[PDB]
Amino acid sequence: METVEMVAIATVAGLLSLATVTGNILLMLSIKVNRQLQTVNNYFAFSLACADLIIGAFSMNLYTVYIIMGHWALGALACDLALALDYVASNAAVMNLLLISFDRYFSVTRPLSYRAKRTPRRALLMIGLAWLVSFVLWAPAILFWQYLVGERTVLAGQCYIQFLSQPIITFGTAMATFYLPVTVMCTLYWRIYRETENRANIFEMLRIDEGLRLKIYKDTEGYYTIGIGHLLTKSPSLNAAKSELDKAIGRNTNGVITKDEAEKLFNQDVDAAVRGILRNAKLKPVYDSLDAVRRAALINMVFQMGETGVAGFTNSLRMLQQKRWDEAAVNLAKSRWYNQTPNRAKRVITTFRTGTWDAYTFSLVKEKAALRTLSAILLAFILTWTPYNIMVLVSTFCKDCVPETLWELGYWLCYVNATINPMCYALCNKAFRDTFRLLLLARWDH
Ligand SMILES: CCOC(=O)N1CCC[C@H](N2CCC(C(=O)NC3(C)CCC3)CC2)CC1
Ligand SMILES: CCCCCCCC/C=C/CCCCCCCC(=O)O
Ligand SMILES: CCCCCCCC/C=C/CCCCCCCC(=O)O
Ligand SMILES: CCCCCCCC/C=C/CCCCCCCC(=O)O
Ligand SMILES: CCCCCCCC/C=C/CCCCCCCC(=O)O
Ligand SMILES: CCCCCCCC/C=C/CCCCCCCC(=O)O
Ligand SMILES: CCCCCCCC/C=C/CCCCCCCC(=O)O
Ligand SMILES: CCCCCCCC/C=C\CCCCCCCC(=O)O
Ligand SMILES: CCCCCCCC/C=C\CCCCCCCC(=O)O
Ligand SMILES: CCCCCCCC/C=C\CCCCCCCC(=O)O
Ligand SMILES: CCCCCCCC/C=C\CCCCCCCC(=O)O
């Protein structure tokens, strides 16, 4: 290799390493330095940042020395240990994306029953096991394959995994580290998106009908409440209500909360109501029969009158599961419920009639930073790891088809995932972008 090429690769690969080290350090420090970022899902973001910091600092720079020198001059032990660090960190990154996806999946689908398991202690447990499973998966086969075969077939001046020499084995590892994780995460995301728009529609429906209060108030019974009828305490103390609010939110609210904190509290309530419906023998068959829109109209009724109240509408409930909506609408209107809240009752009854949201005027689903970040990091993994996995795919159908130059470039693209991951957080999350900016400006000063 020419000296002109040596300096150029060193500068470009060196700046890439610098951009990767900085970005993942900013991500780790942002979570450390900012309280608003100290959340359960960001424990996984920090864990992912640690894996990407190893890729940037170690893997990238060692790969550069290997390319520039044209051979491996550090010995077989140094080779096998460096391969172990590289594969274990790359797999720990994939396993961390799986932890982010699953946590986000359960927190949206099961907000009540999962956010009782969703502690920083359980995040740390899942993180450690992800790093341990990653090590136990790659490191023993990297170091001991030569001993099971009876020969080290990797030549001196060469560094690669011996068991990956056959393309089908490499394809097997690609199925387990790319194809299956990606299919699992895409399926998890489509469920997360569908649930989010479903839950947002129930929130906007009840916001119109019941009303949203961002400050502590008293309900009809005189108990302290917040949001869309979220009971804080039965205790006749405002400080007891404020303390129960801070325990539920995770911050010193002082009796005032945001719409998103009021939506999170409402989604636990939807889960509590849906648990009741499925446990009630009179509401369970009708709810199972109904579609997503009519399910929300039943939830609306439950939120207003209670479990037994809605169960009192025996003939309307029968007509709704028989798909005779015009008939069900007649019986629902001839009630004390319609007489008290005519505007709200008509809107609910129309929802049961049409099966649409026409009685209300709903906006498209507001994609929150969490959903957007998840989609961005998933697309970042698919984009940067696709070239290498296509190269693996074609190598199974054609022996030595893939040029050495292409393996080299596809490996570099895998590494680029570690560079673009902190960018996904900065583009999607305002709090990350401002903390990254704050930290960079603070470092520039002094
Ligand atoms: C999920 C497990 O991970 C993978 O399936 N991966 C797919 C792409 C290949 C990638 N690396 C790229 C650098 C290569 C290299 O020569 N590294 C040294 C300079 C010699 C030892 C250090 C080794 C292979 C690792 C990540
Ligand atoms: C050489 C060091 C580079 C490392 C920087 C850290 C990576 C994070 C930065 C990239 C994200 C870009 C931020 C711009 C936000 C624009 C928001 C938008 O319009 O959606
Ligand atoms: C956080 C993970 C650890 C980061 C440590 C980074 C060190 C790895 C970088 C590679 C360059 C150093 C390798 C020296 C090889 C040259 C010696 C020789 O010519 O034989
Ligand atoms: C209760 C399920 C057991 C979870 C054990 C997870 C093993 C560690 C590896 C991490 C990545 C694997 C996929 C993520 C599963 C997490 C699901 C959960 O939150 O329980
Ligand atoms: C993502 C999974 C792909 C990784 C492939 C590895 C599969 C696991 C099997 C490995 C068998 C080798 C274990 C090493 C045994 C050590 C023997 C000894 O004591 O010398
Ligand atoms: C995200 C979906 C992307 C679709 C994947 C299809 C595009 C393939 C990607 C390009 C890089 C692969 C390079 C293949 C080189 C092997 C051919 C050869 O023998 O020279
Ligand atoms: C990540 C930003 C870096 C900027 C992109 C430019 C660097 C990538 C390209 C350089 C590698 C060389 C590719 C051309 C093939 C040369 C063939 C050969 O080496 O035999
Ligand atoms: C300061 C660093 C300058 C940036 C590098 C320039 C990158 C431009 C993009 C195209 C890829 C260049 C690859 C060179 C091919 C030469 C082929 C060879 O002889 O190996
Ligand atoms: C021309 C297609 C572009 C493919 C993108 C590959 C990613 C490049 C990013 C990192 C820069 C590393 C410098 C290139 C190393 C030289 C390898 C070689 O061509 O022999
Ligand atoms: C609120 C604070 C956030 C704390 C989150 C802690 C998560 C744990 C992080 C991962 C550590 C994984 C181990 C990394 C190995 C590095 C070893 C090395 O330097 O080679
Ligand atoms: C986990 C802690 C790791 C500690 C770092 C150890 C660094 C490894 C040092 C180099 C030893 C190289 C082994 C020599 C094998 C020669 C084989 C050959 O050249 O074919």
Ligand SMILES: CCCCCCCC/C=C\CCCCCCCC(=O)O
């Ligand atoms: C025991 C289950 C009964 C269902 C609760 C509904 C009680 C009806 C009366 C009060 C209206 C309050 C406003 C709506 C929010 C209620 C939240 C909830 O308790 O799930």
